[PDB]
Structures are given as structure tokens and as C-alpha cells.
Amino acid sequence: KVYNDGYDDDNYDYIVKNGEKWMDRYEIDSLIGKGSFGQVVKAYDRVEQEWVAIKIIKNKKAFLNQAQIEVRLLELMNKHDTEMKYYIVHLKRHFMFRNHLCLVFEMLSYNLYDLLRNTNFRGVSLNLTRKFAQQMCTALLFLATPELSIIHCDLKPENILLCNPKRSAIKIVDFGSSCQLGQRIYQYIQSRFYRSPEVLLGMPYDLAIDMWSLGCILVEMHTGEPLFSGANEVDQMNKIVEVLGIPPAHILDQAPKARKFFEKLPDGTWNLKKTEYKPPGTRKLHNILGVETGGPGGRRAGESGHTVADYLKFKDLILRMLDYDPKTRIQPYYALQHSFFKK
Ligand SMILES: CCOc1cc(/C=C2\SC(=S)NC2=O)ccc1O
């Protein structure tokens, strides 16, 4: 059997051969990314004389359609003249090659999960976390612009990449799961660890879900471990409740999936259903962050910029990003005005 004249495998992924040249321009070096959508490869562009990442979409209608949306959003974002756009990954060009849609991006360095792995999952400093935090809030502010109103929908450490390995500048990648503000066609969205409560509760969602994700990411970056690492959605919600308490009554009353995690008593109050968890709100972020005990695990004790005063600024901001209510949850503009960022 042969697929796409022998260019494709059984999955209709392009069979990548190191050293291959495409259209007398791009020289394929190696495969750098693998996904349901297709593959990502590192290539040299002879014309621009630079390294580029090429996202090779699978040769199937479904995956092509998904990527077409990705392209519109990427091109829409690149359209704006604002300087905030530079925190978003830049799509240089797109083309059809051997029945595969290919997105050409600027080559980027290690993702934030790689950084975590490199620390043996013990996290990076508050100073570097602040730098990452400021850039991400700026990125979300840009996404929040009315013309765009883009929800990334899959924010996580892996999806945040450094421009250069020796600088701290970051760019958000993978808009393949992104959508614009509108009707909640998709209920099951976001990576589980970074999934907002509104999504878990099957309620309407806005751009605030990304902000929730950011809060989880920022805590994760400093500690090295996901704030909430549920094995399932129920476990996810229970892990959120451990830190933040039972969600407010006004939310759960409106929540279609409230009874998946909670039960409503005769008095009309909400409790966790029975089916190993600390009581609601007793896994304090104050202690997770090690505000008063020299940071997480005491590894930051004696380090500049790791004072109680510093940690309290970080904690307050995080707690504003992890507001249960998406209408009151801090917005990118206000987050950038937080005392955590002041000099
Ligand atoms: C290992 C992936 O490395 C890169 C990845 C991207 C962008 C991607 S990957 C994906 S999946 N969707 C994107 O937009 C850009 C530059 C890179 O160096």
C-alpha cells in the first residue's frame, strides 16, 4: 500500500526525510514536533537565510480545515501594528506542499516545560517568573483587543517558548485550538491542569479562561510542579477546591455540571460530593509558595528578590488570576498595573 504517491504514511503525515529540499528553498533538518494535527520540522530557508519551523498539517480535510482557522487568526493578529503582537508567534508565510498545508514560523528556542524539566521540576526564580508573567499579561492584553478577541484555549508551559536560549523573551505558540469570543460550541476545552472552573462546570466562557491558565502556569513556573494536577475532571475540581474553597453559590446555581462535583443541601448551600483531599481552602497558596519559609522547599532562602514582601505581591496577583468568578477575575490591563510588576 502507498499513500499520497508514497509521500505520506498511514496517518497521512508527511514522511520527513532529513536533508530534503522543498521547492529550491527550504532544507529540512529534523523533526521537532509531533501532534494530532501533523508534524513540526526545523528547516533552513535559503531565500531569507534563516532557520524556520515548519508546521506540516496532516493530509486530511478535517486537519486542513482546523489549520485554515489557525492561519486566519495568525494573519489577523499579525495584521495589527501594535508592539504587543511580538509576544505572539509570527507566521512568516503559509503554502501547500505535496497536499500538505505548511505554516512557516520564526525558529524559537526551548519551551517553558523544558526549563522546568531542566531544573528537575524545582522551578525557576521569582525574578524570571515576573519577567514571564509580565510578557504573558501583555500577550493576553493583545488577545483581548476587541477586533481580535482571541482565546488561546490551550495555554500551558509547553506552549510558551523562549525567542533565544540566552534571553528571557517569550512567545506564545500553537493557535491550533484557538477560537474567537462567541457561542460556546466546545465545552471540553483547555489542557486539564489549566482548565478553568467555568469550563469544568460546563458554563459559558470568555477570554478570562486564559487568565486562569496563566495563574496556574505562573505558580507552576516558580514551584516546578502543576498547581492542580487532576487525574480526571472530578480530581481536577477537588484539587482546585483544596486551595480555593467551594466555588460561590451564585456560580454553582447557574452551573450545568455543578452536580458532577457538588451536591446542594436542603438549606441551598453547596458541599463536595463524597466520591483523600485536604478540607476546602486549607491547602493555602501562602504555604505552597513558601511565602514565609524561604520559598518552595526553602530553596529560595537567602536569594535576592525572594523576600516576604516580594512573595506577597506574587501571591495577591495569582489569587486575582484564580478568582472563581470570570467576571471579577483580573483582566490583563489591571494585572499589568499590579504591584508585583512595579519598580
Ligand atoms: C518544537 C517546536 O518548536 C517551534 C514551534 C513553533 C510554533 C508552533 S508549534 C505548534 S504545534 N503550533 C505552532 O504554532 C515555532 C517555532 C519553534 O521553534
Curated annotation (Swiss-Prot):
Changing K55R: Abolished protein kinase activity. Changing Y188F: Mildly reduces kinase activity. Does not abolish autophosphorylation on tyrosine residues. Residues 26-341 form the Protein kinase domain. Autophosphorylated on numerous tyrosine residues. Can also autophosphorylate on serine and threonine residues (in vitro). It is found in: Nucleus; Nucleus speckle. It comes from the Eukaryota. Ubiquitous. Highest levels in skeletal muscle, testis, fetal lung and fetal kidney. The modification Phosphoserine is found at S177. Residues 275-304 are annotated as: Disordered. ATP binds at I32, G33, K34, G35, S36, F37, G38, Q39, V40, K55, F105, E106, M107, L108. The modification Phosphotyrosine is found at Y7, Y12, Y26, Y44, Y86, Y186, Y188, Y311. The modification Phosphothreonine is found at T269. The active site is at D154 (proton acceptor). The polyhistidine repeats act as targeting signals to nuclear speckles. Interacts with RAD54L2/ARIP4. Interacts with CRY2. Interacts with RANBP9. Interacts with WDR68. Interacts with SIRT1. (Microbial infection) Interacts with human adenovirus 5 E1A protein. Belongs to the protein kinase superfamily. CMGC Ser/Thr protein kinase family. MNB/DYRK subfamily. It is linked to Intellectual developmental disorder, autosomal dominant 7: A disease characterized by primary microcephaly, severe intellectual disability without speech, anxious autistic behavior, and dysmorphic features, including bitemporal narrowing, deep-set eyes, large simple ears, and a pointed nasal tip. Intellectual disability is characterized by significantly below average general intellectual functioning associated with impairments in adaptive behavior and manifested during the developmental period. Dual-specificity kinase which possesses both serine/threonine and tyrosine kinase activities. Plays an important role in double-strand breaks (DSBs) repair following DNA damage. Mechanistically, phosphorylates RNF169 and increases its ability to block accumulation of TP53BP1 at the DSB sites thereby promoting homologous recombination repair (HRR). This is Dual specificity tyrosine-phosphorylation-regulated kinase 1A. The lineage of its organism: Eukaryota, Metazoa, Chordata, Craniata, Vertebrata.
